[PDB]
A paper describes a structure:
Therefore, the β-xylosidase catalyzing the removal of xylosyl from XDT would play a prominent role in reducing both of the resource waste and pollution to environment. Here we present the crystal structures of LXYL-P1-2 and its complex with XDT. Each monomer comprises three domains as some GH3 members. Sequence alignment of LXYL-P1-2 indicates that Asp300 and Glu529 might act as the catalytic nucleophile and the acid/base residues, respectively.
There are two monomers in the asymmetric unit. The electron density clearly shows the existence of xylose and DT. The xylose adopts a pyranose configuration. It was surprised to found that the glycosidic bond between xylose and DT was broken in both of the monomers. Although the E529Q mutant did not show catalytic activity in the standard enzymatic essay, it may still have weak activity to digest the glycosidic bond of XDT during the crystallization time of one week. Thus, this structure should be regarded as the enzyme/product complex.Fig. 2 a The 2Fo-Fc electron density map (blue, 1.0σ) and Fo-Fc omit map (orange, 3.0σ) for xylose and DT. b Comparison of the overall structure of LXYL-P1-2 in substrate free form (gray) and XDT binding form (green). In the complex, the amide group of Gln529 rotates about 40 degree to form hydrogen bonds to the side-chain OH of Ser466 and the O7 atom of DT. The side-chains of Asp109, Arg174, Lys207, His208, and Asp300 stabilize the xylose by forming hydrogen bonds. Compared with the free enzyme, the only prominent conformational changes in the overall structure upon XDT binding is the movement of loop Ile222-Gln229 with the longest distance of 2.5 Å. DT molecule binds at a pocket formed by several loops: residues 220–232 and 324–328 from domain 1, residues 379–383 which links domain 1 and 2, and residues 446–450 and 529–530 from domain 2. The hydrophobic environment, contributed by Leu220, Ile222, Ile224, Val227, Ile232, Phe324, Leu325, Ala327, Leu328, Ile379, Thr383, and Ala447 form the hydrophobic wall of DT binding pocket.
Author numbering:
A (entry chain A), B (entry chain A): 48 to 803
Write the structure that this text describes.
Amino acid sequence: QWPAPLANGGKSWASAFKKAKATVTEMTVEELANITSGVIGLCSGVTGAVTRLGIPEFCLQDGPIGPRGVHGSSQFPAGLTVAATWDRTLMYARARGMGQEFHDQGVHLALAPVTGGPLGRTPLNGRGWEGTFADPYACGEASYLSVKGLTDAGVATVSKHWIAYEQETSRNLYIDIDGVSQADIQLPISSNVDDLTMHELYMWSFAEAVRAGTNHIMCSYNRINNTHSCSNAKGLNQLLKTELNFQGGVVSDWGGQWDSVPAAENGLDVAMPGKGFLGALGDFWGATLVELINNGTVSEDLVRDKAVRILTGYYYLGQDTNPPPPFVYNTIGAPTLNATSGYRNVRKPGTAELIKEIGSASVTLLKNTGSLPLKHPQRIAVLGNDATYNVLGPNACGLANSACDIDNLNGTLTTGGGSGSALSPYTITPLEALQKRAIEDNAEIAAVVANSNTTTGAEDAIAALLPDADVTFVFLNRYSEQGADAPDFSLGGDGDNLMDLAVTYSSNVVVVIHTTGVVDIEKWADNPNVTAILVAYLPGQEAGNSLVPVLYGDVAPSGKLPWTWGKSIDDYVPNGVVYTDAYSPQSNFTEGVFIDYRWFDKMGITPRYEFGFGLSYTTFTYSNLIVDHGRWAKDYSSVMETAEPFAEWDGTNSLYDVIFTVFATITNTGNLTGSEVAQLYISIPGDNQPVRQLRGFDKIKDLPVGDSAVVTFPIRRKDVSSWSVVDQLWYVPNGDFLISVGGSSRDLPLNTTWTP
Amino acid sequence: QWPAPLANGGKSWASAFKKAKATVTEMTVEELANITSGVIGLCSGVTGAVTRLGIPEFCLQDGPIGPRGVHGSSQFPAGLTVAATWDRTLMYARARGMGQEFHDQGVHLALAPVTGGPLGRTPLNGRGWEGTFADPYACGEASYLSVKGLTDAGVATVSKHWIAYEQETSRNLYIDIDGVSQADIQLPISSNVDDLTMHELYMWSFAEAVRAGTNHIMCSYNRINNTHSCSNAKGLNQLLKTELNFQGGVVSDWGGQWDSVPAAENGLDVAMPGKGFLGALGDFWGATLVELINNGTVSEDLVRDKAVRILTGYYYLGQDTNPPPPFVYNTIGAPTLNATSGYRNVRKPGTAELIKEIGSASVTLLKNTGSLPLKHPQRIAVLGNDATYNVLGPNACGLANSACDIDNLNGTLTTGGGSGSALSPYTITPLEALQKRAIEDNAEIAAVVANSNTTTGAEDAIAALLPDADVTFVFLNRYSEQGADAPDFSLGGDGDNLMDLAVTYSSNVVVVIHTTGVVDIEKWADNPNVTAILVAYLPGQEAGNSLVPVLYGDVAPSGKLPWTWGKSIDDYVPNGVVYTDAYSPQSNFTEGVFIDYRWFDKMGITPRYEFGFGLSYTTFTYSNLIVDHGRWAKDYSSVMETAEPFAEWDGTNSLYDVIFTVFATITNTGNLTGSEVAQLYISIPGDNQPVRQLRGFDKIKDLPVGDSAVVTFPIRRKDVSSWSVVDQLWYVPNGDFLISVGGSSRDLPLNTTWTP
Ligand SMILES: *[C@@H]1O[C@H](CO)[C@@H](O[C@@H]2O[C@H](CO)[C@@H](O[C@@H]3O[C@H](CO[C@H]4O[C@H](CO)[C@@H](O)[C@H](O[C@H]5O[C@H](CO)[C@@H](O)[C@H](O)[C@@H]5O)[C@@H]4O)[C@@H](O)[C@H](O[C@H]4O[C@H](CO)[C@@H](O)[C@H](O)[C@@H]4O[C@H]4O[C@H](CO)[C@@H](O)[C@H](O)[C@@H]4O)[C@@H]3O)[C@H](O)[C@H]2NC(C)=O)[C@H](O)[C@H]1NC(C)=O
Ligand SMILES: *[C@@H]1O[C@H](CO)[C@@H](O[C@@H]2O[C@H](CO)[C@@H](O[C@@H]3O[C@H](CO[C@H]4O[C@H](CO)[C@@H](O)[C@H](O[C@H]5O[C@H](CO)[C@@H](O)[C@H](O)[C@@H]5O)[C@@H]4O)[C@@H](O)[C@H](O[C@H]4O[C@H](CO)[C@@H](O)[C@H](O)[C@@H]4O[C@H]4O[C@H](CO)[C@@H](O)[C@H](O)[C@@H]4O)[C@@H]3O)[C@H](O)[C@H]2NC(C)=O)[C@H](O)[C@H]1NC(C)=O
Ligand SMILES: CC(=O)O[C@@]12CO[C@@H]1C[C@H](O)[C@@]1(C)C(=O)[C@H](O)C3=C(C)[C@@H](OC(=O)[C@H](O)[C@@H](NC(=O)c4ccccc4)c4ccccc4)C[C@@](O)([C@@H](OC(=O)c4ccccc4)[C@H]21)C3(C)C
Ligand SMILES: CC(=O)O[C@@]12CO[C@@H]1C[C@H](O)[C@@]1(C)C(=O)[C@H](O)C3=C(C)[C@@H](OC(=O)[C@H](O)[C@@H](NC(=O)c4ccccc4)c4ccccc4)C[C@@](O)([C@@H](OC(=O)c4ccccc4)[C@H]21)C3(C)C
Ligand SMILES: *[C@@H]1O[C@H](CO)[C@@H](O[C@@H]2O[C@H](CO)[C@@H](O[C@@H]3O[C@H](CO[C@H]4O[C@H](CO)[C@@H](O)[C@H](O)[C@@H]4O)[C@@H](O)[C@H](O)[C@@H]3O)[C@H](O)[C@H]2NC(C)=O)[C@H](O)[C@H]1NC(C)=O
Ligand SMILES: *[C@@H]1O[C@H](CO)[C@@H](O[C@@H]2O[C@H](CO)[C@@H](O[C@@H]3O[C@H](CO[C@H]4O[C@H](CO)[C@@H](O)[C@H](O)[C@@H]4O)[C@@H](O)[C@H](O)[C@@H]3O)[C@H](O)[C@H]2NC(C)=O)[C@H](O)[C@H]1NC(C)=O
Ligand SMILES: *[C@@H]1O[C@H](CO)[C@@H](O[C@@H]2O[C@H](CO)[C@@H](O[C@H]3O[C@H](CO)[C@@H](O)[C@H](O)[C@@H]3O)[C@H](O)[C@H]2NC(C)=O)[C@H](O)[C@H]1NC(C)=O
Ligand SMILES: *[C@@H]1O[C@H](CO)[C@@H](O[C@@H]2O[C@H](CO)[C@@H](O[C@H]3O[C@H](CO)[C@@H](O)[C@H](O)[C@@H]3O)[C@H](O)[C@H]2NC(C)=O)[C@H](O)[C@H]1NC(C)=O
Ligand SMILES: *[C@@H]1O[C@H](CO)[C@@H](O)[C@H](O)[C@H]1NC(C)=O
Ligand SMILES: *[C@@H]1O[C@H](CO)[C@@H](O)[C@H](O)[C@H]1NC(C)=O
Ligand SMILES: *[C@@H]1O[C@H](CO)[C@@H](O)[C@H](O)[C@H]1NC(C)=O
Ligand SMILES: O[C@@H]1[C@@H](O)[C@H](O)OC[C@H]1O
Ligand SMILES: O[C@@H]1[C@@H](O)[C@H](O)OC[C@H]1O
């Protein structure tokens, strides 16, 4: 085994550690078992109180778009959607806003963000949308800022899911309900991950989360090399708590804990949900952990270290001197918990405008043949239930946005299904917003929003409506959800039918896709009747009013794709989702570090739309690439430090030191003002190395016609490193490094060589 | 027989008559038959050209809300809806706006307004909504202003339908299509109307239409005393063309003409639609009328008088010196007419705001227990497909708003079905408008707009949503249409179910009814969970934005009911709709003059909501009734004059002279500013006379709290007259007249006696 290292508070939590140790020193064995296992309450999870010492219950609450199952709050855009902005300021402000609302609702610990698990090995991942980029570097940057935004608002974070949690299928949470136990059916999928892949690929974003000060981390459902993540000594005690120097608590996912003793010894700190959800998801600690200590199987001091880890967050964020107000909403639901809900409104001035701005900044133009931007069209047709409201109400699908019937017309896809969803005070529909703009132009506008296959008359309505239209907007979607992967890339609902009808009857079709990921558009993407295609991802509540200004040219589109859009699912990493009824299911990560565009680049597969692709209404020319070797600096700014070994280590040094900076220049060479995401890729020399790896991005805002601006990329030591499996450390390999800059992963007009 | 009197141009058309006679004098027999029978074209009806003399084809076009089947136009509110405003200025401006759009689309003759047929003998009349009030006096005033507004814009009018056209059922238009002829199935319903009833009840509004200068009149489908209206000598040659002194043309309804010779001799002028609609609706004139003249059966001079009547309008409105532009839309439809459509936009600045104002002025508050006006509710539920768009598009139901399937979710009922409908450039939905106001108050709002009986989950969505709501808006409707009467008072669609669910789960339910007439609300109107009830009638395109300001108190509601709302259909005139398969179906108008509230008042039946009932957010006190006998004046202002005989006639005199004026005073005695419709009723002494008869209305706008204003009622000679069947003239009977003033037909705090 790898022994459990003791918390010491590290960099920023030293004083809070000290108060945590003082309190925990006073605790009895019953009290230690109480704080470390869940109890019944209104939140996703609730830690027992330590009543005698005045430590209250902590509310742990979903989710990564804001607190789930609460009224009086805003529905923020999904992580996928903010990734697609490529705007650091928006990644932070989104998180800070979510945090404000978490705090004002009474949440102590936010079950957020998703910071690298699932990272994106398969594009069918039913919950991939909760994360950000299918790229370690960019996911790392988003994860850093998301964590910082949440904690800066006074909410502790529980970053998730550690680690190699890359498929929902056979995730097999522990559950024992009505005589049928998952242990007797099938064990969780095992992620079989080589050491290099674990370091260079899956750990990257978690390192950034630890550096940003995440207070906790949640261990996933999957197994790793046939050992449960939540009792994987190598995972938690070694890689997380030793190499990453993590100082906070490891919280089990809900049914992630499979056992009592291995869990306490191998790095687990908090058993969730404990007595919540009827005890059906395992209840391995609590009174049972009291007996394990008193009879000497589990070390008392070991358990005190778990308590210390939990309380460090409490004191660091000042939840003692500034308590959160009470959490008033039943987010569990009857009959599981019968208990009434109060009411509180926490929506602040500015939040609706921020959510709108994220939408306008993310929406991504994949195809424009000249129909966009719109001028002042006079006869406008609109097709698709995605254009309008859920017919049962925007929250009809319930507490996790997953309970409406398989055929329901859910309206605009504003968030995905599951624990990462949230309620919505309203939906600004695409149709409401297009209609407002139509009225200003004295135009007419009509929408067919029924099911084009199963409602009588819809097809003929469509036939009758489209030919005369100046433009036809088609709104498509693809719902996906926690607990299943998507079967394939197929549009949800009547999507395919809408598109076949649309091109039969209109030669100016503009397609807008609200989705949790990549969809199959192969039948029509090259039809010249589809004059424009845009993906708007998951925009939360301001869906229509964020889209329409971009469509009409008020602001040029500036979003780019945060993953690869291949022409077929066969173009990706093989065995993305393993289906088997084998009792011990296996997923071998044979691809290694080569996921998403790294796979495409290495096998020479040409995607339909590459990673980092997006059109504007203008063009940008790249020039004057400069590598400034003299432009280096100490890492002073992190909240916490890791202990990742590296070759050049000398006591005063860091893996996150900036060792040089790359500069380049962009010129708007088109006819309209626009923003541009500049991207930097490095080819690190070695055996079996990716052709190139994203190591920088910078977004210039609203570059006027003919103007220029400089983009700037700080390069850290780690960014040019490789991990030595033989030596067990990060090193900068000798050799020629290629540095590329440009507008996508495949449009890189500038390059240069750098040698250390 | 009653011989056909010759046109002479009467009062305002004298010079146009002269030019008409000159032109017609030059016409051959072929040319006379061409102008007097319909030909194929893009409009509802088209008169043949007289090519040699440069007289083009005239476009006749539906309908009484504006030109039908046209893009580029606005959907105005229905006549029912403007009646409910009780605002003369709005009745005029609505008509003038409709006229502008008629003209700018190229229409020569508008098939509008509905000016007393159907007037409202039965509240089940499928097309009652096209007219205004179920009251001769008020229908007369609306009819005068509607006609004036249309002609003032340069469009000739064809006022309809003459006369005693009081049920759609067995209207039996002539049609002979695919070997099956209506003549071999069933004759039109016969209206058996006594002479007093015809004069005091059905003729009243047509007299006002003739006085306002209607250029034509359309004869109805029904028979009168077992003679078709369109060949009823007594109807057309005598009552219309002699007593009413009508100087314009009688146009057949479409399939209203049953014969060639009786029609030419008994007063018909224009055979419509002629060769249009495949000749299937009879084609009795045209080439056949050429042979009838040349072989001497039909007098040539008689036919010249028809031509003269048609051309008088053309010259009077200046359609020669200012031609209408071309009519560019196929309003017939393929396969009946295959022909392409151009495009023109005629929507002017100001029209959308006028249609909104009519909505805000008409919406009628029937019940308010204190829930209205709304303050700033934070959780708002909305129920009903009426709250949102037609799922197939607002115009999906086609050229006459009547072709969507029996179950379709048609969305907000903005106009009724049939030839009196029109297309809509958009629908401002109740839900869009409530949502905008919710957003301003930082509130949440959710709508269940599916079918609550047949869509899975809707009922539970409803159960789950309503209890927590501060207010629940329920939107109900009742579509009806030309060519059928309503079976009963039942809400359309899932109405009944919505209301049962609403009161189970909310104690603050506010009901809004969009309808073509009275509906059965008896199950819930007295439930204290229904805290407010409003009828909004048919608001055209600005449905939501006209309603919401009234709901939120920006303006107090000031509409009142234009018909009686009885508790059951058994409370009305019996035999309202006769159903039979008898070849010659009969309707005996045994009730005489006693329709609508005259029936209720006479039989001592207490309606649920009386004629002229509506609540405000304030109250008004009535005081200081004055009859000013000295306040009389000559009738100088009419466009045309009738020749109605009357006892006091002396050459310089008129039946429309004002013989006194009634004044009264209203004081706003509540807490909020509001508008008030003041109503005047006279009890004319006689045998079998109504208890009281509306003879005045005046609307005070925005009366501040504690302020007073005077309402003024001019009383004409005709207004205190009766018709002598023995003498065949109007007379003022000797005796005591009761004069009542107040806020409804049953809330009349002021009264006084007047003797001639
Ligand atoms: C899930 O399972 C996979 C299953 O394999 C696990 O992965 C393994 O992870 C361990 C670390 O826990 C690796 O152990 C290290 O192995 C080094 C030798 O590697 C070479 O030999 C092995 C065995 O014959 C091969 O498998 C390797 O091949 C792979 O890597 C190469 C190189 O890139 C590729 O080309 C191959 O194709 C494979 O991908 C190698 O050829 C070994 O040197 C290393 O030794 C040090 O580290 C430990 C500390 O843990 C010390 O105890 C030991 O004393 C050595 O440390 C001293 O020495 C160095 C100097 O040499 C100093 O710098 C130190 O500070 C110190 O004083 C270590 O044992 C194993 O190789 C790796 N396998 C693969 C295939 O990746 C996952 O960890 C497992 N995960 C979980 C979560 O359970
Ligand atoms: C659909 O059918 C109904 C079926 O009846 C038709 O109605 C009738 O309409 C005609 C007019 O075209 C009426 O004719 C007039 O009758 C007068 C006599 O009426 C009394 O007797 C008759 C017959 O016995 C009764 O039916 C009447 O009863 C009804 O009215 C009374 C009174 O209120 C009620 O109490 C009853 O219960 C009934 O409702 C009466 O008791 C008759 O005097 C009148 O005579 C003059 O008019 C014509 C001009 O058309 C002259 O030719 C004639 O010379 C008289 O005119 C001179 O005399 C007067 C002075 O007396 C002068 O002032 C004149 O200027 C002139 O020099 C006339 O014949 C008939 O009564 C009426 N029936 C009913 C039941 O209403 C509908 O018209 C028909 N409609 C259509 C469209 O086809
Ligand atoms: C299994 C699971 O994930 O359950 C939890 C409760 O904590 C878990 C975390 C999860 O995020 C949470 C909160 C969610 O938010 C999910 O979005 C969520 C799910 C993914 C879903 O999960 C499932 O459908 C399970 O696969 C499903 N499992 C089974 O039917 C099953 C039974 C025996 C052996 C193996 C499987 C299940 C359905 C309904 C109740 C319990 C279990 C249950 C669950 O009801 C929700 O489940 C419960 O609320 C619940 C669980 C146990 C008892 C009572 C209630 C779900 C929702 C909200 C729909
Ligand atoms: C019967 C009738 O009212 O037809 C007209 C055409 O001029 C009439 C006036 C009417 O206002 C007009 C324009 C309308 O606008 C109506 O809203 C309207 C109707 C009320 C409707 O009328 C009916 O449904 C008839 O009762 C119906 N009648 C019969 O089926 C019938 C056949 C034989 C004997 C007795 C009855 C019918 C349906 C479809 C085509 C022709 C007749 C036809 C009609 O298609 C529309 O009809 C046609 O367009 C049409 C008529 C004949 C031949 C070809 C087309 C209708 C619409 C638009 C739906
Ligand atoms: C509107 O949103 C709805 C949710 O709020 C969407 O419904 C969900 O959609 C997904 C598919 O996209 C379904 O997931 C699959 O469903 C089945 C499992 O169903 C049952 O099968 C057996 C029963 O014998 C049993 O094993 C299961 O427990 C289920 O009872 C499988 O095909 C897949 O494995 C996968 O889980 C959801 O089931 C469905 N939810 C519900 C509650 O029906 C809906 O698709 C949205 N509308 C549109 C157009 O996208
Ligand atoms: C949405 O608006 C729709 C129209 O655009 C509404 O559909 C119409 O609604 C009325 C009833 O409210 C129906 O009128 C009745 O229908 C039938 C006649 O149907 C057939 O019966 C025989 C066939 O064997 C034949 O004689 C007829 O020609 C018909 O084929 C009778 O019950 C009545 O006499 C009456 O005419 C319309 O038929 C219906 N239109 C269509 C095209 O189906 C719809 O109701 C609206 N939705 C809601 C919720 O109100
Ligand atoms: C272990 O955890 C238990 C569950 O959290 C804990 O119990 C709970 O104690 C809290 C206070 O710490 C109580 O909360 C409220 O109760 C009283 C009235 O009874 C109020 O005056 C207070 O304001 C307070 O809000 C809970 O009632 C109680 N919950 C349950 C389910 O019993 C135990 O105390 C913990 N045990 C140890 C050893 O600390
Ligand atoms: C009786 O009515 C007929 C139908 O309206 C009428 O015919 C039509 O005549 C018009 C002009 O009055 C023609 O309109 C266009 O034709 C020529 C080109 O062919 C253009 O140069 C002109 O600009 C004009 O717009 C119609 O083509 C014609 N319609 C049909 C169906 O024949 C007869 O002329 C009328 N008969 C009499 C005796 O007047
Ligand atoms: C310690 O406690 C656990 C849980 O009750 C029990 O299974 C185990 O056998 C105990 N050890 C001894 C030595 O009794
Ligand atoms: C494009 O639309 C036109 C109608 O606008 C249609 O006739 C043509 O077949 C369509 N083209 C394709 C490739 O579907
Ligand atoms: C009114 O609503 C309440 C719930 O708000 C319900 O319990 C009660 O039965 C309802 N009353 C009626 C008369 O339906
Ligand atoms: O937040 C948790 C989610 O990430 C996990 O997968 O399911 C349990 C949830 O409550
Ligand atoms: O306008 C006409 C309408 O009033 C009549 O009833 O049907 C024929 C229509 O075209």
